[PDB]
Structures are given as structure tokens and as C-alpha cells.
Ligand binder design. Sequence first.
Ligand SMILES: Cc1cn([C@H]2C[C@H](O)[C@@H](COP(=O)(O)OP(=O)(O)OP(=O)(O)O)O2)c(=O)[nH]c1=O
Ligand SMILES: Nc1nc2c(ncn2[C@H]2C[C@H](O)[C@@H](COP(=O)(O)OP(=O)(O)O)O2)c(=O)[nH]1
Ligand SMILES: Nc1nc2c(ncn2[C@H]2C[C@H](O)[C@@H](COP(=O)(O)OP(=O)(O)O)O2)c(=O)[nH]1
Ligand SMILES: [Mg+2]
Ligand SMILES: [Mg+2]
Ligand SMILES: [Mn+2]
Ligand SMILES: [Mn+2]
Ligand SMILES: [Mn+2]
Ligand SMILES: [Mn+2]
Lengths: 289, 289, 683, 683
Amino acid sequence: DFTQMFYNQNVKQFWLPEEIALNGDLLTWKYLGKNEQDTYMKVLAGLTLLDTEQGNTGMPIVAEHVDGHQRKAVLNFMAMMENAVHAKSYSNIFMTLAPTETINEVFEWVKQNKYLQKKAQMIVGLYKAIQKDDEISLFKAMVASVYLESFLFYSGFYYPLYFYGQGKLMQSGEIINLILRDEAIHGVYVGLLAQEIYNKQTEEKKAELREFAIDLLNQLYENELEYTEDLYDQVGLSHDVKKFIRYNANKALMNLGFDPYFEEEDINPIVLNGLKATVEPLKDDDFYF
Amino acid sequence: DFTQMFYNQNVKQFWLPEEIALNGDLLTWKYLGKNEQDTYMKVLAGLTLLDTEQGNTGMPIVAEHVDGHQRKAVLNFMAMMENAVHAKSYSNIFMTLAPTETINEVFEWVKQNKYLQKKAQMIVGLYKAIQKDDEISLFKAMVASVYLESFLFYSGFYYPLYFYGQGKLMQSGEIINLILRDEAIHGVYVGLLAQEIYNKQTEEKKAELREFAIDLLNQLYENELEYTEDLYDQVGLSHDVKKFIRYNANKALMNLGFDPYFEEEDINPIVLNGLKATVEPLKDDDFYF
Amino acid sequence: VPKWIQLNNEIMIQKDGKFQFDKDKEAVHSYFVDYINQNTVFFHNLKEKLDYLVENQYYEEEFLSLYSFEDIKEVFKTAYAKKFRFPSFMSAFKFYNDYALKTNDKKKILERYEDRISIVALFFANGDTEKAKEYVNLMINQEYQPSTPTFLNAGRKRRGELVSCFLLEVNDSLNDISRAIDISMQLSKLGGGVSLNLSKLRAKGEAIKDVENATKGVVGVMKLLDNAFRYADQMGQRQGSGAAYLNIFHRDINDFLDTKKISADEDVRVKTLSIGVVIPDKFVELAREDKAAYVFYPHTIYKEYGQHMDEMDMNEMYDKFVDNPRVKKEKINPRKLLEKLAMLRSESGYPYIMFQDNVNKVHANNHISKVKFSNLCSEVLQASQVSSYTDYDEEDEIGLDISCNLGSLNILNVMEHKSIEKTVKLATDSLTHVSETTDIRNAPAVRRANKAMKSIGLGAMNLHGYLAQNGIAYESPEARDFANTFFMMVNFYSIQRSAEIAKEKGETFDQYEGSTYATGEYFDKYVSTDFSPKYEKIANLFEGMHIPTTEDWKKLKAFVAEHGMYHSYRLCIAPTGSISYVQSSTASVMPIMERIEERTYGNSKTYYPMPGLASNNWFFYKEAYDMDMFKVVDMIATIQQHIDQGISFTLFLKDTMTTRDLNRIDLYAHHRGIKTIYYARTK
Amino acid sequence: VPKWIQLNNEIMIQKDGKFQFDKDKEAVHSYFVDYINQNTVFFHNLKEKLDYLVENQYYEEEFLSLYSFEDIKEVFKTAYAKKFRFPSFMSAFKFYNDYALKTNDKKKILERYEDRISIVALFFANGDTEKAKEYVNLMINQEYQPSTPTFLNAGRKRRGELVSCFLLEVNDSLNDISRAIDISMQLSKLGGGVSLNLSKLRAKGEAIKDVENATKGVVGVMKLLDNAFRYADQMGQRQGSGAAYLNIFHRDINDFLDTKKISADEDVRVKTLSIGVVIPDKFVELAREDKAAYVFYPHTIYKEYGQHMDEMDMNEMYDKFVDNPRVKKEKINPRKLLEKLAMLRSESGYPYIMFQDNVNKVHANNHISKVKFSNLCSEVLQASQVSSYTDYDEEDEIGLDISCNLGSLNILNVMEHKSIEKTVKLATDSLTHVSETTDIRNAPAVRRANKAMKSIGLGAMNLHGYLAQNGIAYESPEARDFANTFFMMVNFYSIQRSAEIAKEKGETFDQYEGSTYATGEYFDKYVSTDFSPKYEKIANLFEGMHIPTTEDWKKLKAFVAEHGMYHSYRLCIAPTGSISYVQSSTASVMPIMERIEERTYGNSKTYYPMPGLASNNWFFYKEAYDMDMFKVVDMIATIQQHIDQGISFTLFLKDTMTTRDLNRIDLYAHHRGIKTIYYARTK
Ligand SMILES: Cc1cn([C@H]2C[C@H](O)[C@@H](COP(=O)(O)OP(=O)(O)OP(=O)(O)O)O2)c(=O)[nH]c1=O
Ligand SMILES: Nc1nc2c(ncn2[C@H]2C[C@H](O)[C@@H](COP(=O)(O)OP(=O)(O)O)O2)c(=O)[nH]1
Ligand SMILES: Nc1nc2c(ncn2[C@H]2C[C@H](O)[C@@H](COP(=O)(O)OP(=O)(O)O)O2)c(=O)[nH]1
Ligand SMILES: [Mg+2]
Ligand SMILES: [Mg+2]
Ligand SMILES: [Mn+2]
Ligand SMILES: [Mn+2]
Ligand SMILES: [Mn+2]
Ligand SMILES: [Mn+2]
């Protein structure tokens, strides 16, 4: 009942980072403190890693196991967006704002950062555990994918949105909003596929799947807290970002058909402001008048 | 040396089925004989069936085994074009020209056809034989992929190009020309990835891979001749189609860095109508001797 | 924002449900009193002005020296006595931006409308004070408008030529191709548009001195000409404009048409070169019967018969060419070629279509030559003879290359003044003077044909404006009745003036005695058929103005037979692009495209309502896209029967109509006697 | 796979650790016995063959009628008396694929090597049987090779011109530019490469008769010429090749160079037009001191001084141009321009570098004109005068456009026969005959300069082959000693033959009296310096041959003063591309690129070892890329001091060489007196 409308929405949302000129951010970037620039680079690098794996691994593997040519076409399109559009856009931003050495250093930093490695290990592990014709392993990977789309990106998205909302780094911010617009529909779509599998189960099996989903969310959440503190303490925003990730965790649960898990909190209003002619053959009668 | 350049060329060639209005083809379709309509339907179904294998297996399997983030992104983009763009385009052409019952029957016929099946299963067999961390099996699959993209499609493309060059079925011919333009670049790109593997091999292993490629080409070519007579004798075109197959076989070989196998031949004119070393400054004392 | 363009934009602000058309009068008044009078250089007396203009290389001393300054003063008084006022902002803006003389730094304004008109009139009269006053009255009343080259350059020192349309015949030789490139660059340097016939050139794959498959065809010459026109672009302000014409029976016709396809490669596509296709009645007959047509290799025909293919009658030699084994031919589908023509015109507006047998069945000078191609504007239809440019040491055989001076009657102002006869005769005299004073010293055939043929083109404009301001629909039979009577009268008085000029000067145009004027066959339909208006509404439009009858045409025929004709060709209806704004007239005899025309000049947006547009005649100003092209074809064919040359006929197509509709319009135009089709404009 | 192709492929099969060089004799023997003797049309007698060739439009009856058939039979006897054998398969293959006369369907072979040589000799002698026999002995011994045009076309009815290098001056006018395009197409039609001097054309953004910033510059003319050469593609046989030369002080020099960048826009890039840059000593002096230089607008200089910028000495006029406020210029960095030149040569091999003051400091005809540019192969360096092509009605002012006739001595065969004097004099006679018999009807300046200057080009080839077969390294001082002595002797005997021809005909070349030959300034270094070999090994190479001394040069100087000099120019070392295979010789005076040449013809690959390559002389055949380009510059400068025109000097570079290394090579060539640099070939 939904794939065709998602197909149409995904293809109509198609974009490339080159559509957005980035040289306009040069001055507002220059004006940020060293702490702010550091957090910003690292935040986008963490996002780049997530999209790299979502494009290389997550979306293609889910596409492989989901039945139906139209469902596969949507998932293939989403996969392309992840690595050919989203992951690449971050390099466009980096290449504009930062010198090569700072770019090299931040990519080295992703490799050695323990929270980023842990979250990649956990998510990709679940993708690679999918067994052919085994719907339960597929469900588990789809939960992981929804958590990546609708929860994990948001510790990263906070900062570009926070600046956009203050009228700073607005070209980079425009790119990020386009990425976010895509991930929102990706999270909903994968959520609907996960619910399909969940709804086939016995009540006992469903109870176990909810346990899996909640245990996984809590494990990812605890890691994300440490990641958030590590990045945002130097810019004074860790508590604010934490509220934002809890907000989005609830959206991820809802995408999976589950009740919200965290209590509602006031999000920084700045971040909320951050959001041919037809050819017809000649007849014989055409030559007489 | 080449992936970013191909990335650029691929994304700038992006298109959607909806861009070409198909209904005006009915004004020339109605004037074709039964044999012409039959051949066109059968050719179209042949292309559709082969392209589906490439979208569901060929491109995604190669993307899975190739190392490199940028290569995986380009390959993902190509897989997207197969599944999201090409497949919808073929379906659109069919739905415009034939009623539902006729489409189902043509696909039943072509699905049972000996020559279409022989080539489809030969290609799919090589994709299924790729082994993790074995570059030889990957190379063999890449050869199969290049043969599909740059050679096997062309016994089929001939007919729409033949009409397109005569002013008939111009809307569907425009679509086919866009598809063909994508397959050409797909073949060239996968060809470069195959040459990379080939160049890492010993001289004895190279000679062995050359023998594999020529042997495979021979098997496919002999089946193409039979496929060609089966479809095109009823419309009197087989001689010229055979010249077009050999010409495209030579292009496929050149994509794989191999010499042409067949002598140069001229192609049907109607179908043709359808178709830095290192900068160093002078630091003085270079003007004195 | 300028005050005048702010006032001009108040036209679109609908007050009480109506456009504020009166704002354009306020717009032009503000334009003058805030820009023009401020930027106008004013001298103490006209003597100081003329001395300043002559001394500083603005004017020519030779033509001003034929009048005593009292006569020049009288002429300028006659111009200023009318107290002409531009009715719209666009008229004055276009004049003072395109035709008004400006200082060498393009800073101030030296010429007003009256000054330019007086200078053009003194140039036309050539020493005659009374004739200069007559020309001043003619142009200040806006009854006659000299073409953009003449009106812009008459009496100016650093000027281009007064003729901007040239037609060149290219012979099948490398010497002739090189000379064609040279002459094209020379004429484009002068500012003129150059049309070239490429039919005599042998096709691709023909032999060059017994080595076969050596000729690159007409497309290589097309690329040469395209780069020659790109080079000679006159600063690039108006880039070099060229046209190439090919007979539809040329073997290279498909490659000739493929140069305009959107998917054409950079090694084939031509950008600055318009293309026209000459279609004999044989091709239309072959397509009608759905038979198999043949395109021919011109060099084989020339070798076999000793004549070029386009110099022969295809309706009588096509079967001989097909049956001849020594003639090389290629099989084509004529209906497929017609569909390709329609598709190319839909996608690009090209090629121009010339119906060769429609031109030549009424052509008056077939003894000199048949018309084989048209000009860049697709309305000049004259006999041409190809030149034979030989090696450097040898003498060249100079032929006849076409060129005519353009001039338009304003139908509205001519009809208001009841002065068809006087306007036509004075315009004929002015065009004759422009022909006589033109001397192209780098195009030998153009010069020879200008001296020999003495061809002029007298067109008309404001046909739709006059009809809409008189409550007549363009498609209505009454409009065609008016056009019939008006253009028959124009033809009558142009023939009378040509005969009077021949009698006075004692000379006719070269090879006049073989023309249909000399034999009297030209006047058959005029001495047999009466062209008086058939409707009482139209007959009142001509009240107070004598309409020549059959007896008058018999007397004129006797007069022509006894005195001859000075001009081989007299009437051609050009597009009249930018002078239509200055004259406050609709462009040519074609219907209007937009009722209110919106344009952007620099960073300013301004709107131009059609001349005389109001609420009482809003629906009589029907846009060209909303009307039936069959009725427009009927109107143009009614006008064409009184025009010796062609009419620049633009086809106005909607997006909904297919290529079949365009082909039907083309075939109906061919059936109705349309000589040329200019453009396929799509909205 | 053909048997001869298999045998030729066995050279690379290494037997006993060595290449099987003897397989090429088997390869050529098999090639002949299996293909040539089968496909050679045989006639019962020579009379029947000659009659068949003249009557079937293969030969010219005019030159053959100059002899009785007995004389022609004896000439053919002399050709076949040598029993000439092609030493390698590639020699015979190249001759019988490029120069041997074939049937009109290119199926059989009419001419053997002896027949072609006999016909060329009979054409050279022009009625003299003993002279024809002398030419037969000279060519069958392969001491002298006429150029590809002369050798291929002499005595053929359907032949191109015997000259293939032309140099045209283009004047700053549309008439002259159109004439240049016409003449370029006419000469490319004849099959000749055309070089155009674009330095007189005014730069981009110059005024055209009071309209400022209207000129497209030299790049618009470059596009016109590129399309002209693409169209005139030699009847679709061989791609039309042309060259454009611009002075480095021309304002458009950067635009001129940007036409060869790989990233060049399609509206700027030229494909078939080679480019050469002319560099005066002033530019090198400015770059040496890193002073910022000025490029000048040529039309401002012409208006200020009445002379073209390239007609004046930049060494004295540069400061005056810079200090003149009425001369327009822009600052450039000469070192950056040099680096751009080196980068362009690394990327594409362009432009050619012509050191203007190196050419003109030893130019013998500076009174006629300075040498302003070179040909397409960068070895023709002659005085030229620009033509003033006026309007069609007016009379043109014809100047001098360069065109010289090419011939090559085989250094190995001339040295082994001890016949420097006889070969040089006979080659001079043959080149003189080719010059007299050349008449070009569409290039008036080329024809006038051919009639007046009577300039010829006598080159040399097989220098590296002769040295390596004699155990002398190309970079060795002994090689330069041999080149010095050999080319001094060649110059001596060419001057002697030219003076003898002047004495016989009683006429010198036009404006000879102002030349350095007339004043004796040419002979100063020859009457003051001894050019005998300084090495005993080299002096032994000239045993049995009189090396001209200082007294001999004084006698020659007196003889030239008494009798004059027939040829303005005599010696130019052309690349000698395809005739080197037929002669079994290394190309020109350049060192060999590869020891064994791997080429593919059709679907079969062929191997060509350098002539005389073996195990004993393997390392004397050092590849050009492995060589020190400074020593190659030294060799060419040693040769250049005895050549009145230039030498085609190709730079052979490694991939590791930087832009600085190429610039250093160019600056050392300039320092050593190198006149032109042809190509930058990178491995
Ligand atoms: C020289 C040349 C001619 N042509 C074409 C253009 C001309 O229309 C046509 C005639 O060339 P010509 O200049 O007339 O050549 P020709 O006189 O030697 O040959 P012929 O005896 O047949 O007349 O050949 C080319 O296409 N490319 C060329 O390079
Ligand atoms: N004074 C003047 N008159 C001009 C100029 N341009 C055109 N004219 C026209 C206006 C008159 O019709 C005519 C005579 O003007 P004038 O020389 O001032 O004469 P007058 O007003 O003393 O009779 O010339 C101009 O610049 N100055
Ligand atoms: N017979 C013959 N001789 C040829 C041909 N092409 C070149 N020649 C040369 C070979 C001889 O040197 C010369 C004379 O040949 P001939 O006419 O057979 O002479 P002869 O030996 O009978 O007196 O011509 C050729 O085709 N046939
Ligand atoms: Mg000719
Ligand atoms: Mg000039
Ligand atoms: Mn993403
Ligand atoms: Mn996503
Ligand atoms: Mn596909
Ligand atoms: Mn594909």
C-alpha cells in the first residue's frame, strides 16, 4: 500500500551537493572558535562514517533480502543516496572549509574513536548477521537501520542545525537539511518493513522482539551519551544534545510501531528554527484540400 | 585514476522515465506489420529480462566484492539506474504499446525461449560463482558483466535504433537511447575494474584469463547468432544485425583492454542515424652556460 | 527605477478591470522630458548643428552639399512643422536606442526623429528640395519607413551599407567556395545578412578529378561558412548571420537537415547559419502519391547533361535522372523527409521552406533564370546566375547575385491619408535611389546584379494593426478582401512608377524584353479579373481613393509595353523587425504574437501594448497563436498574388499540434500558392 | 599470417641470446618472391609497358617524348644493371605501399624500384640521356633521395605538386585573411603543408576603422584556417596539415598557446593547425634577467611607425615600443611564458620554437627581408614579403611566399661512395629542375617567390646510421667533427654548383646583389677557419676525398663574386619521414628513437631494426631518449653552422624530465645557435 508513494517521494527528492554553492559559509566558519570548528568537523566525520556503512552495507543487504522489484528499487535508490550523495556531500563541506591536513586528521580520528567504532561494530554486525530466508535476522537488522536513520544521526545533525538556526553556516546547513529530509523518509520506510515482519510473529515472539529492540536502543543510547559528551563538552552543549537524541529515539521507536521510551523535554528553540513535438505520420488525405 | 571522473559522468546523465511522453508512439506502432510488432515485443522483453538480472544481481554483487568507498558509490549509482530507472522505463514502453494480456504472453514466451535463457543463465552463473576474497572469480564475473553491458544488449538495441533512425517509435527510441548510453558507461567502468585485477596477475595467469574471456565470448557469440536468426529472419534484418553484434563485441573486448576479435565492418546507416610531466620553475643560472 | 518605465509598468495594473493603456502616453512624455531632452545636444541654430556633424565625421558632406542651407533649413522646418509625437514609450525608446545618432562616446543624443527623417529625405532627394520635402512629409506622417540599414545609415559617414540582404550562388569548385567564403565575410562585415545556394555543390562521396568518395559534401562548406560568419560578426554586437539553401533533391539533404538537430555533434552542427530547403512541385507530388523519391548526386547530373541540377526543371527531368544509369541517385522516402522537415521546424524553426514551383509559375524573369533560393529572411525571390570564379591568373565569369533595398509602407497611415499612389511612387523613387547609390566593391556579382536588375523591395506593415483598429478580424474574409484590393493597388502603382522611371531614364532593367512585363503575360489576371473590394465595409475603407479597374490595368499594360520597366522586382514583404516599434505598427503583414508585449532591457522590465490596442478592439487583436494557420495561409496567399517577390511567412504553432499539423499547414501553403515559409514559431 | 610477416617476426625471437637480424633478409626475399613478383604487372618489352603507362593516364607524355626510346631503354638498363636489393622487409614494404605505381583499382603493381627511379631520373634530366643515367646511378646507389612529393609524383599524369612545404604571410586585413584561407585550401588540395605567419594580424580587442575592441585576434583566423585545412583534406586521402606562427611579443601569444591545451574550449581549440612561436633574443634577454616583459598590439605599432611589429628589429625597437604612449601593450612575465611553453611542449609537443635572432644573425638575405617564421616542419627559414591583396576590382600587390624543394643525401651511401661533390651537385641540379618545373596557379606570391628566389632545400639523412655503423657515438666529439667536415663539404659543393648554374644561365636569384654572398660576408668563417677533421679516425673516413680548405673557400668566394649565386637558399634538413625506410636510413640527422621499430600494419605487427643494427654496433645505436639532449643540441648546432636554412630538431625527452629541464634544453639550444626546435617527444 505504500512502496509506490515512497518510490515517487524518493526520486522527486533527488539532489547533488554541487547544486549548493558553499563559498558563502567561508566567513561564518572563519569566525567560529577553534573548539567550535573541531566539534563541527568531528560531528560531520561521524555522520560520514554512518552514511558510508549505510550505503556500502546496510541498504544493499536489506535490498537483497526484501522481496519485490519495487521494494528493491526503493531500497537501492536509498542506498545510492547514502554513499553517492550523503557521504560525498560531507567531503564537499570539508574541502571548502578546511585545509587538507585538518581533513586528513579528522578521518584518522574516526578510525581511532572508540564510540564511533563501537556503534559501527554493533550496527554493521547486525547487517552481516542477516540469514537468507530468515525473517527474524532481517527484522533485527531493520531495527538497527531505523536506529541509525532516526536516532544515531541526530547527535551529529544537532550542530549544523544549531548554527543554521542562528543564521550561521547556512549553505552547509542547507545540505544537512536535505540529508535530514532523506533520512526521515528512509527511517519511516524501513520501519514499515520491520513492522511487517514483527506482525507475522506469535505474541511470545513479539515480546522477545520488543526486548531486542529496547535492549539494543539502550545499549546504543549509553554509547551515544559518551560520544555526545566527548564532542560537545568543549562547546558547552552536551546536555542540550542529549535532550535532542532522546527526542529522536522516541521517533525511531514510533517508526517501529512502539511506544515512546523517554519523557518529553524542551529542545533548544534555535535547533527548532534550524528545521520535442509529437510525431504523427502524414495521411494520404493530408495532401488534398 | 578514474572513479571520480566516472562518478561525474554517471550523475550528470541522471534521468527519469516520466520525462519522455510515450503516447505519441501509437501513431507509428499501428502502422507496423505483425512480424515487426512481434519482433519488437520479443526484443523488448529480452532486454527487460537481462536488465533485471543486472539490477538484482550483477551490479550489486560487484559492488559487494569491490574494495574502495568511491567505487562502491559509483557501482551503487549504476545499480540504482538499473532498478529504479531502466526497469520502470521498459515497463512503461510495454504498457503503452501492448494490452496487459499481450505483455504477459510475450514474457511467458521469452521466459521459455532457448537462446534468451542460454545467455541469461550463463551470465548469472558467473555472478553466482564469485567467492569472497577471490579476485579471479570477481574478474570472471566482471567479464560477464561487460559482455552483457557492451555486447549482449546490442542484438536487442538494434531494432529500436532501426525504427528510431527511420522516424518510427521515436518516444520509446529516445528512452532506449538513454538506456543504451547508461549501459555503455557501465560497460566501460566495469571494464576498467576488470583490467585492474588482470594487471595484478602473473603472465601465465593473464594468458589463462585471456583464454577464459575469448572462450566465453565465443560461446555467447554463437548463441547470439542463433538468437538473431530466431528473431530477425521474419523481418529480413539478420545479416545487418550480425555485423552490429560483432562491432559491439569488439567494443566489449576493448573495454577489457583486449584486442578486437572480429574484422572491422560498416554498420547499417539507419541504425547509425538512430545511434603533464612536472611543472618546475626556472630558478636562474639556467640562462647561463 | 526610471520614472518613465515605472509609468510604463502601470499599464498592467488593472484599474476597474481594464489595462491602463493611457499610461504609455504618460510613460513616453516622462521618457522625453526626463531623459531625451536632457541628453539631447542642442545647438544655437541648425547651421551650427550641421557644421558640427559634418566636421566631426558624423555626416557625409557630399549629399549635404547638393542643397543650399536655405533648402536644408526648409526641409528641417517641414519635418518639425508636423510636431510628431511618439504614441508609446516603446516607439521613442527603440528609436533613440537603435537609430538616433549619438556622440562618439555613446553619451548624448545628436539626432531627434525629425533630424533623422530630414537627413534621410535629403539623402533620398539627391539635390531636389521639393522632393526632399515630399520625403519628409512621407516619413514624418509615417506612411513609408525605409529599412533599418537605410534609415540607420542614410547620410552618415561611418556607416554600413544601405542593403542588408544578399543572395550568393556558389559554383561547384574550390575557387568558387573560397570566393563564396570571402564574399560572405565581406558582406557580413558590411552588416548584411548573406544567403548562399549550396545546391550546385556536389554531394558527399563524389569524385574530385577521378578520385572517388573525395568530396565532403555541402556540410563541409556549411561549416566553413558558419565559421566565416562567426568571424565576421562586427564586434559581436550583431553576430554574422548567414543562410544556406539546398534543393530537396540534393543527395546531401538529410545531412543538410541534420546540422540543425539538437543531438547533432560539434563536427556537424552549424550554429550561426540558418538553413532553407527548396522544394519543387515534383517532391510534393511524390510525397502525395507515397511513391519512392530519389535524391541525386549533382556532379553526376552535371557531367551527364552539362547543366547543374538546380538549373534544370525537376518536374520534367526527374524521370530522366532516375532512368539515366550514369546519374547517381539515392532512394529516399519523400513522406519521411516531409515528416523530418516538420519535426525539425517544430524543434528548431528550421529549415525555411521555399516552394520552387510556386515562386517560378508567377516569376516574371524566368528567361534570365529561375528562382532557386531565398534570402536569410526568406522573402527575396529573384533570378540569379552563378559566377565562375577561376584561378588567380584567369578572368572570372561574373554572374548575378541577388540584393534588394527594403522599404515598408505603413498600411494604417497610408490608408488614413488616402495616399497609396503617392506613397508607393515616392517609396519606389527612394528605393531606386538607394539601389543607385549602392556599390559593393568586394562582391562582383552583387554589384553587377544591382546595376543590371535594379531590384527593389517595397513591403508593408501594420496590416493586422490596421484591421484590428478598423474592427476587422485577421482571419475574416473581409480582411483578405482588403488585402487583395490594397496590394493590387500597391502593385499597380509600383508598376506605374517603374514604367515612369524607365521612360524618364530611357533605360529598363537588363533582359527586360524577355520578361513577362514585356510580353504582357504578367498583366493577364489584372486585365481579366477585377480586384475591387467585394464587401461594402471594405469598399468604404477605400472611399476617396481611386481603385484601378480592368481598363486602368489595360492602360498600364500598354504603358509598360511601350516604355518598359526599370525594376526587375519591386515588391517584397520583409519581417520589418525593429522599425515596427518606431512606426508604432505591427510587424509586417503577419498577425500579432502578443497583445501586450513584455520585454526586459538590461535590468529594466517594460511592456509594449500593440499599436491602438484598447478595450473596444481587444478581441480584434487576436494573437497569432490562437488563430487558424489555414486562414493565415489564405491571407498571405491573397497578398502574395500581388507581390512579385516573396513574403516572410512565420508559422505560429501551439504546443498541442503535432508534426502532422505542421506538415498539413505546409502542404496547404503549397496548395494555396505560398512561395516561402519563414519560421515555425511555437508558443 | 603472411610468410614474410612470420619471418620478420622471428627477429624478436632471441636465438643464442641475440636477435635474429638475418631473418629480415629472408623476410624481404619471401615478401618479394611471394607477393611482389606475383602482383607486378609484366610486359613483353619496355616499349609496351611505357605505351600502356602513357596511354592509360599513368605517365606524362611530355617528359618521355624528350628522349628517343633507345635512350629510355638505356636508362632503364642502367637502373636494372645495379641489381638493387632491398636489405630489409620494411624498405620494400614502404616503397611498394607508398611510392610504387599501382593500377587505378590499386590491385596490381606497375612500377618496381628501378622503374620509379628511371622515371624520376628521366624527368630530372629533361632530355639529357647522360644526365638521366647519372641520376639513375645516384638514386639506385641510394646516395640521393628526392623528397616524398618529388619521388612519388615525378612523371605521373595524376600527380600532386612536387612541393609540399609552403609558407604564407598574412596581412592585417579581411581581404588578405580571406586570400590566405583560399591559398591555404588550394595548397592543401595539392597535398602540401602550409605555414601561415599570423604576427601581422592585430590582436584581440583592437579597433577596426574607428570601432574599438572589435577584432577577434589571431585565434579567429586560427579557427578559420583550421576549418579550411579540415575541408581541404587532400580529396579525403590524407588529413590536411597546416601551421600557424606567432611572434612571442604578439599580444595574442597567450591565446595562441591556449589553443593547444588539453582543457581548451571547443571555441578556442584548434585540431589540425600546428603552432610555432617565434622568439627574438629580446625575449630571452628579458626572461634571463627576470624583468617583466610587454606584449604589444600590432596595429598600434603599425599606426605609430607605419611598419609592422614583426617587420622591425625588436632588439632596438622594444624600448621605443614600451616608452611610446601611443603603442598599446600589457605586462607579461617572460619566465612564466617560457614555463608555459615548456609545459605545452611536454603535454602536446607544441609549439615549435623559432629563435628569430639565431636565424637572422646568419641569414644571407636580410636585405630582402628577415626570416620571420618557419614551415610546418620547422626547417625552412627564408625571407618573405607580405602580399597586399586588395579589393576585387583593384590590383593586388604580390609579395614573396616561401616554398622550397626538398632532397636528402644519404650520408652513409655518399660517404661509402666518396661522392660528396658529385652527389651534392647532381642533387642541386635535380632540385633546381623541380623548382623551375613547379608552377602554382592559385598562390601568386608562392609562384613569384619560386620564380625569383629559386630556393631549394638539400637535406641529409642516415647520420646516426652512418656513425653507428662506423663505431662512432652520436654524442661523441668525433661525431660532431664528422658532421662539421661533412656539412662544410656539402655547403661548399652546393655553393659551387649554385654559382656554376648562375654562370651557365647568366642569372642569379632576385636581389642577390644585396646578399652576404655578393658582399663576401658569408664566406668569412670559411676563409678564416679550417673545417678539416680534428680526429684521425674522422680524417680517415674522408680518405680519397678532397676536403675543401681555406684556399678552396677563397676560390669559391671569388667565383661567387664573379658569377653570382643561383639559389637564395640551398640546404635545409627536413625530417624525411617515410623515404628513410625506402633508403634503409635513419631519419634526417636526428638520432634513432628506437633500436628496433615495432609497428602494426593492417592486422599484422611488423618489426624494423635500425639499418645496419647488429651485435657489434648495438650500443652505438643509442636511443634518442637515452641520450643527453645537450649533446644532441651540440651536434645540431655543429651541423646548423653549415646549413643556410634550418634543421628539423626534435627534442627527445624522458617522462622524468620536468618543465625546467625542457626550458634548459631550449635555452641551451638558443645559446648554441639553434635556429628552430621542432618537437618535444616524450617517452
Ligand atoms: C579541393 C576540394 C574540393 N572539394 C569539392 C568541393 C567542390 O564543390 C568540388 C569541386 O572541386 P574543384 O575545385 O572543382 O576540383 P577540380 O576542378 O580539380 O575537380 P573536378 O575536375 O571534378 O571539377 O570538390 C572538396 O570537398 N574538398 C576538397 O579538398
Ligand atoms: N536651432 C536648432 N534647430 C534645430 C536643431 N536640430 C534641428 N533643428 C531644426 C529646428 C527648425 O525646424 C530648424 C531651424 O532651426 P534654427 O536653425 O534654430 O532656425 P530659426 O528657428 O532661427 O528659423 O532646424 C538644433 O540643434 N538647433
Ligand atoms: N621486358 C620488360 N622490361 C622492363 C619492364 N619494366 C622495366 N623493364 C626494364 C628491364 C630492362 O632494363 C629494360 C628493357 O627491357 P626489354 O624491353 O625487355 O629489353 P631487351 O632486353 O629485350 O632489349 O626495361 C617490363 O615490364 N618488361
Ligand atoms: Mg572544378
Ligand atoms: Mg586594413
Ligand atoms: Mn544518509
Ligand atoms: Mn538513510
Ligand atoms: Mn539497465
Ligand atoms: Mn547497466
